């Protein structure tokens, strides 16, 4: 009785939301952008190949200066690379060999890692002794950590398999805020350019936009058919691209509050592991399970180019802050730079 | 320039040399050791086997290092994780074997059927096609008592038990009842028909009947891991 009427009320709220969205879709993005010139053909070439990892590499995150990167591999190793000279700067071993995510602090004074150990380990790179040792450990989560990004030196947001996200305090050690509402595992998250709002994409085929202070979900975005594996904002922060296992990327507008265009092709039947935008947002780079990466026109939904320099599945793909080059890391323990 | 750039480059090269030297020994140790992942249900008896391994020699993963005849082994137990395992099971594609322990006597409603796709999904998973799985059918003693009593029947939960016969290559233990002998071999074939359906000769299954108090479980893993990386080497030589 009570549960049934709550379900009916939720259903008619959803109906009202869908009707409101339909009353807003006056014209599609394709019709508006049919009158601009195409980007032509882009041919990205491989410059640097980084070698030295034993096992498969999952994650990398470019620095603020677009010069250094960090790579995490199941040999228990976080290798901090310098991309310009292909020289290894740091190599941090772990207590637990299984790592799934990594992050690089905007100030460059810290790095983060986590995984099946349920512990977010924050490593300090500016130790007085000169050796890098574990600086902070956070163990409040009850699920595997899938992604973690820094807000500043003293705060971190972590997405775990407990269907909840958490904003911590490194100095304090306790969870400052918890974000609940996702029904599945939160696989990836992306921060806004003004670090004021952030989206979390889960295995419930949905993404949610959260406010850092308020700690409440502002808007929920659906439309995907499978598990959302990667998510990234547009440079302006008013839209974002989501990639899922259904071999489709989708662009959602925050102000419009529904999808704008879907990037998909009939020749792709493999999942999407990593999505990232260019500096101007005109091109969308998506890494796929077929050992291949595709660069799409963000305004034409046309496959602009193909990058096929990997042997195993592409696990991480990132565009620098300056957008000069794109780094792709795959399971064959190789990191590559394209430009 | 060489005023300061040369010194920085030299220092960075020396550092990279030091990390390469350390990673050489780290890689030697890593290749020396073999990584095993332990999976099972909540009542599959994996804790008993872990304790038996540990006595001879909330955290989200427990690491057990033991040596059998001067060979390193890493044994990972997954805990404090949700039952949704379609995401983190991809982390174990490079393990030499997945020690799968299934409570045989636990046939909610049906642990054995639920345990079947936990093996089937692993077998047909895209990223686990190159990982061998060792099947351990625990609680052999408890299985025998239930069959001898006759209270519970396999045919109630598996309709194909009626027409199945005892394998001609079977080697029953002395003093074992003929009835329990046929039943305990039927469970193996349930995992075996799934085992040889796909893969096209890239990973195989190594069933073994073990008791929770058997001290020779190290030898079974010793011989299986001796053979898992012995068939893989034989596939590169096209001798198989």
């Amino acid at each position, epitope marked *: 009785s009570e549960l049934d009427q709550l*379900r009916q009320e939720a259903e008619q709220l*959803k109906n009202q939301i869908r009707d409101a969205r339909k009353a807003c879709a006056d014209a599609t993005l394709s019709q508006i952008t049919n009158n601009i010139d195409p980007v032509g053909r882009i041919q990205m070439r491989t410059r640097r190949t980084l070698r030295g990892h034993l096992a498969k590499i999952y994650a990398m995150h470019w620095g603020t200066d677009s010069r250094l990167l960090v790579s995490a591999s199941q040999d228990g190793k976080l290798i901090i690379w310098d991309s310009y000279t292909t020289n290894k700067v740091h190599a941090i071993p772990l207590r637990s060999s299984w790592v799934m995510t990594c992050a690089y602090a905007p100030s460059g004074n810290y790095v983060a890692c986590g995984g099946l150990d349920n512990i977010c380990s924050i490593y300090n790179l500016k130790t007085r002794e000169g050796n890098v040792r574990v600086s902070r450990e956070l163990a409040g989560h009850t699920g595997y950590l899938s992604c973690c990004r820094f807000l500043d030196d003293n705060q971190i947001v972590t997405s775990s398999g407990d*269907t909840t996200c958490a904003l911590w305090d490194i100095e304090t050690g306790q969870q400052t805020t918890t974000f609940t509402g996702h*029904t*599945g595992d939160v696989m990836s998250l992306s921060l806004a350019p003004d670090t004021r709002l952030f989206v979390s994409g*889960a*295995c*419930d*085929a949905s993404a949610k936009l959260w406010d850092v202070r308020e700690g409440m979900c502002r808007q929920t975005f*659906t*439309g*995907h*058919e*499978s*598990d959302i594996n990667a998510i990234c904002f547009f440079p302006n922060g008013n839209a974002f691209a989501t990639g899922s*296992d*259904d*071999a489709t990327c989708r662009l959602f507008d925050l102000r419009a509050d529904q999808e704008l265009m879907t990037y998909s092709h009939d020749n792709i*039947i*493999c*999942g999407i592991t990593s999505v990232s935008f260019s500096k101007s947002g005109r091109l969308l780079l998506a890494g796929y399970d077929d050992f291949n990466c595709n660069v799409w026109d963000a305004l034409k939904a046309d496959r602009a180019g193909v990058l096929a320099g990997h042997d195993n599945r592409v696990s991480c793909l990132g565009v620098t802050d300056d957008g000069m080059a794109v780094a792709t890391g795959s399971w064959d323990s190789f990191l590559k730079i394209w430009n | 320039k060489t005023e300061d750039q040369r010194n920085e480059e030299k220092a960075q090269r020396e550092a990279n040399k030091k990390i390469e030297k350390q990673l050489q020994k780290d890689k030697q140790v890593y290749r020396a050791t073999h990584r095993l992942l332990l999976l099972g249900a909540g009542e599959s008896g994996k804790n008993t086997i872990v304790k038996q391994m540990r006595i001879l020699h909330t955290s989200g993963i427990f690491e057990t290092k033991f040596q059998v005849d001067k060979v390193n082994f890493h044994m990972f137990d997954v805990g404090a994780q*949700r*039952d*949704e*395992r*379609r995401k983190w*099971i991809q982390c174990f594609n490079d393990v030499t074997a997945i020690i799968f322990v299934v409570a045989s006597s636990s046939y*909610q*409603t*049906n642990r054995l*059927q*639920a345990a079947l*796709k936990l093996f*089937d*999904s*692993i077998w*047909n*998973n*895209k990223w686990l096609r190159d990982t061998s799985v060792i099947l351990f059918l625990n609680k052999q003693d408890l299985l025998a008592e239930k069959v001898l009593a006759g209270k519970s029947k396999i045919e*109630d*939960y*598996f*309709p194909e038990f009626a027409r199945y016969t005892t394998p001609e290559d079977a080697t029953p233990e002395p003093g074992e009842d003929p009835r329990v002998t046929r039943a305990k071999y039927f469970i193996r074939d349930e995992f075996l028909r799934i085992s040889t359906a*796909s893969g096209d000769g890239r990973h195989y299954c190594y069933p073994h009947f073990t008791c929770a108090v058997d001290t020779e479980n190290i030898r079974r893993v010793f011989n299986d891991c001796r053979d898992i990386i012995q068939r893989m080497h034989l596939r590169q030589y096209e001798l198989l």
Partner: nanobody, 128 residues
Framework: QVQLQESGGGLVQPGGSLRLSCAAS????????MNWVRQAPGKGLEWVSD????????SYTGSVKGRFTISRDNAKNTLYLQMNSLKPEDTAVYYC?????????????????????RGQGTQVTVSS
């Protein structure tokens, strides 16, 4: 929005027959293989049946093999489960589930307690 709605449940006398229907919207139904699961009162989730993308691969559990018939219609995006000769042990809440990824032979976490890709389910009660 991906939504799966089930219908056809209710109370059935022993030995009866029922037809559970699952209507799925928000995705390409022809690219996924589908499952029927059940939950006994006071017990955990137990898988019942599964059907492949084109209907070639159909498998049944031990308790319902030969008594259940699963089918799918890609034209209307509908999934049908015909239950024959119902017994009191079949009294459960039945759910229509979909595999997490398309074009995948494996199907993980369909018996998980907090699975997102399942409908609210329907009650099927066998009583005298």
């Amino acid at each position: 929005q991906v939504q799966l709605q089930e219908s056809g449940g209710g109370l059935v006398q022993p030995g009866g027959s029922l037809r559970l229907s699952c209507a799925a919207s928000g995705f390409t139904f022809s690219n996924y293989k589908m499952n029927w699961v059940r939950q006994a009162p006071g017990k955990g989730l137990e898988w019942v049946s599964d059907i492949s993308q084109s209907g070639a691969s159909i498998s049944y559990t031990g308790s319902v093999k030969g008594r259940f018939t699963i089918s799918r219609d890609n034209a209307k995006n509908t999934l049908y489960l015909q239950m024959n000769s119902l017994k009191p042990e079949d009294t459960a809440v039945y759910y229509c589930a979909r595999c997490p990824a398309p074009f995948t032979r494996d199907c993980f976490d369909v018996t998980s307690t907090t699975y997102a890709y399942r409908g609210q389910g329907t009650q099927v009660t066998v009583s005298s």
